[PDB]
Scaffold this active site. Sequence first.
Site, PDB file in Angstrom:
ATOM      1  N   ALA A 159       0.827  -1.194   0.000  1.00 37.75           N
ATOM      2  CA  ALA A 159       0.000   0.000   0.000  1.00 37.75           C
ATOM      3  C   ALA A 159       0.866   1.250   0.000  1.00 37.75           C
ATOM      4  CB  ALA A 159      -0.932   0.001   1.197  1.00 37.75           C
ATOM      5  N   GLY A 160       0.613   2.136  -0.958  1.00 39.57           N
ATOM      6  CA  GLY A 160       1.365   3.368  -1.078  1.00 39.57           C
ATOM      7  C   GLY A 160       0.565   4.554  -0.580  1.00 39.57           C
ATOM      8  N   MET A 186      11.355  -4.538  -9.091  1.00 34.81           N
ATOM      9  CA  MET A 186      12.510  -4.705  -8.202  1.00 34.81           C
ATOM     10  C   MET A 186      12.161  -5.790  -7.183  1.00 34.81           C
ATOM     11  SD  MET A 186      14.652  -2.455  -9.452  1.00 34.81           S
ATOM     12  CE  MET A 186      15.855  -2.088  -8.173  1.00 34.81           C
ATOM     13  N   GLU A 187      12.577  -7.021  -7.473  1.00 29.91           N
ATOM     14  CA  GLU A 187      12.085  -8.195  -6.737  1.00 29.91           C
ATOM     15  C   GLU A 187      12.359  -8.151  -5.229  1.00 29.91           C
ATOM     16  OE1 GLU A 187      13.339 -11.934  -8.349  1.00 29.91           O
ATOM     17  OE2 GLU A 187      12.725 -13.098  -6.605  1.00 29.91           O
ATOM     18  N   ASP A 198      15.279  13.260   0.136  1.00 32.68           N
ATOM     19  CA  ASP A 198      14.715  12.160   0.915  1.00 32.68           C
ATOM     20  C   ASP A 198      15.485  10.886   0.627  1.00 32.68           C
ATOM     21  OD1 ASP A 198      13.010  11.024   2.817  1.00 32.68           O
ATOM     22  OD2 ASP A 198      11.392  10.622   1.384  1.00 32.68           O
ATOM     23  N   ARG A 209      15.174   3.229   2.786  1.00 30.94           N
ATOM     24  CA  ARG A 209      13.790   2.869   2.487  1.00 30.94           C
ATOM     25  C   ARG A 209      13.345   3.312   1.101  1.00 30.94           C
ATOM     26  NH1 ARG A 209      13.610   7.090   5.876  1.00 30.94           N
ATOM     27  NH2 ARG A 209      12.708   9.030   5.052  1.00 30.94           N
ATOM     28  N   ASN A 210      14.059   4.279   0.525  1.00 32.36           N
ATOM     29  CA  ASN A 210      13.732   4.824  -0.780  1.00 32.36           C
ATOM     30  C   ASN A 210      14.646   4.283  -1.867  1.00 32.36           C
ATOM     31  OD1 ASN A 210      11.553   6.328   0.090  1.00 32.36           O
ATOM     32  ND2 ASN A 210      12.809   8.107   0.632  1.00 32.36           N
ATOM     33  N   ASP A 267      11.491   6.843  -5.353  1.00 27.61           N
ATOM     34  CA  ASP A 267      10.689   7.778  -4.577  1.00 27.61           C
ATOM     35  C   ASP A 267      11.094   9.224  -4.796  1.00 27.61           C
ATOM     36  OD1 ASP A 267       9.667   9.190  -1.903  1.00 27.61           O
ATOM     37  OD2 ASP A 267       8.573   7.292  -2.183  1.00 27.61           O
TER      38      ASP A 267
HETATM   39  C1  LIG Z   1       6.872   4.281  -9.183  1.00 28.99           C
HETATM   40  C2  LIG Z   1       7.188   3.107  -8.286  1.00 28.99           C
HETATM   41  C3  LIG Z   1       8.121   3.256  -7.271  1.00 28.99           C
HETATM   42  C4  LIG Z   1       8.414   2.183  -6.436  1.00 28.99           C
HETATM   43  C5  LIG Z   1       7.800   0.947  -6.620  1.00 28.99           C
HETATM   44  C6  LIG Z   1       7.989  -0.164  -5.773  1.00 28.99           C
HETATM   45  C7  LIG Z   1       7.588  -0.033  -4.438  1.00 28.99           C
HETATM   46  C8  LIG Z   1       7.021   1.183  -3.722  1.00 28.99           C
HETATM   47  S1  LIG Z   1       7.868  -1.556  -3.706  1.00 28.99           S
HETATM   48  C9  LIG Z   1       8.479  -2.363  -5.083  1.00 28.99           C
HETATM   49  N1  LIG Z   1       8.891  -3.712  -5.185  1.00 28.99           N
HETATM   50  C10 LIG Z   1       8.619  -4.672  -4.162  1.00 28.99           C
HETATM   51  O1  LIG Z   1       8.059  -4.364  -3.131  1.00 28.99           O
HETATM   52  C11 LIG Z   1       9.054  -6.108  -4.345  1.00 28.99           C
HETATM   53  C12 LIG Z   1       8.092  -7.080  -3.704  1.00 28.99           C
HETATM   54  C13 LIG Z   1       8.459  -8.511  -4.016  1.00 28.99           C
HETATM   55  C14 LIG Z   1       7.297  -9.483  -3.934  1.00 28.99           C
HETATM   56  O2  LIG Z   1       6.146  -9.075  -3.620  1.00 28.99           O
HETATM   57  O3  LIG Z   1       7.489 -10.707  -4.183  1.00 28.99           O
HETATM   58  C15 LIG Z   1       8.445  -1.444  -6.117  1.00 28.99           C
HETATM   59  C16 LIG Z   1       8.953  -1.892  -7.463  1.00 28.99           C
HETATM   60  N2  LIG Z   1       9.360  -0.931  -8.426  1.00 28.99           N
HETATM   61  O4  LIG Z   1       9.049  -3.088  -7.709  1.00 28.99           O
HETATM   62  C17 LIG Z   1       6.842   0.816  -7.625  1.00 28.99           C
HETATM   63  C18 LIG Z   1       6.552   1.884  -8.466  1.00 28.99           C
HETATM   64  C19 LIG Z   1       5.535   1.704  -9.578  1.00 28.99           C
END
Ligand SMILES: Cc1ccc(-c2c(C)sc(NC(=O)CCCC(=O)O)c2C(N)=O)cc1C
Length: 278
Positions: free
Chosen positions: A21-22, A94-95, A138, A142-143, A156
């Site tokens: 959740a964002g 991003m796994e 920032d 975490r970012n 972020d």
């Molecule tokens: C624009 C944007 C920025 C960041 C992300 C992003 C998150 C906020 S979290 C996450 N990837 C994961 O959490 C991996 C989870 C692995 C799993 O569930 O098996 C991302 C990302 N880019 O993958 C997303 C967006 C669209």
Amino acid sequence: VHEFAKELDATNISIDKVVGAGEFGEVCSGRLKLPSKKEISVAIKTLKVGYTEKQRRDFLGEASIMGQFDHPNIIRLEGVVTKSKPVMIVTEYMENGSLDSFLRKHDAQFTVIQLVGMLRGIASGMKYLSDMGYVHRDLAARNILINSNLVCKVSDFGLSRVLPIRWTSPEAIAYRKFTSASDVWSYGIVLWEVMSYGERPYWEMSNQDVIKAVDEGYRLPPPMDCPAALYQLMLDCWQKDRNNRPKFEQIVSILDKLIRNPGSLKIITPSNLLLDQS
Ligand SMILES: Cc1ccc(-c2c(C)sc(NC(=O)CCCC(=O)O)c2C(N)=O)cc1C
């Protein structure tokens, strides 16, 4: 938003899973079919139903910024969906998620060289980001996102601006003096976070004491088994005089040397914070 972001066709996007959740809605994983027919894994941010016009501009603002950066260590924007609903931001997948949560799962499990690789990627992204006239403001573990091959990428761009107390430089705290040199301060904090496997900067110290201690010259102590070279790089990043902090290009250079000779890293380093006299 379309100056720097392609409008994607929703028929080319499959949503496979809600992963979190964002601020503005859900974060999902899925797939994107490119014009060439190649299919790639993507992450997808959705804009919550019932959004205000302000939420929409803020949401898509992150995409307008992200879209300006094409770099292996900056999260890659594939595009946006605005002409249909829900409104979406699509990026590379991003796994391994955010870097601080990833490192917390793997305390002391990586080699120093592996950690330095991570740190080099972050610095290289920031080198590009600063080259482009952007102050992130920032920069924090975490970012940073990390992928299946441990490549770390700056993400972020919510607070990012054209030229969070724990990660902010003294001068930026004191009177909002944000420069690329205050991003370098933040990088020094990120470096501490990485070598600490995702410990919180300054733990749970009250904000007032974080500000006061740092100003008085106190600094985060060396993480367990932290190479002297990496701790000193934190200290350099945390110079009181922002003028005296290294540039991101120098940080990248420093880390490229430490990567080259793993023998470098073999030297290991009255209060919990240390009083850096420099
Ligand atoms: C624009 C944007 C920025 C960041 C992300 C992003 C998150 C906020 S979290 C996450 N990837 C994961 O959490 C991996 C989870 C692995 C799993 O569930 O098996 C991302 C990302 N880019 O993958 C997303 C967006 C669209």
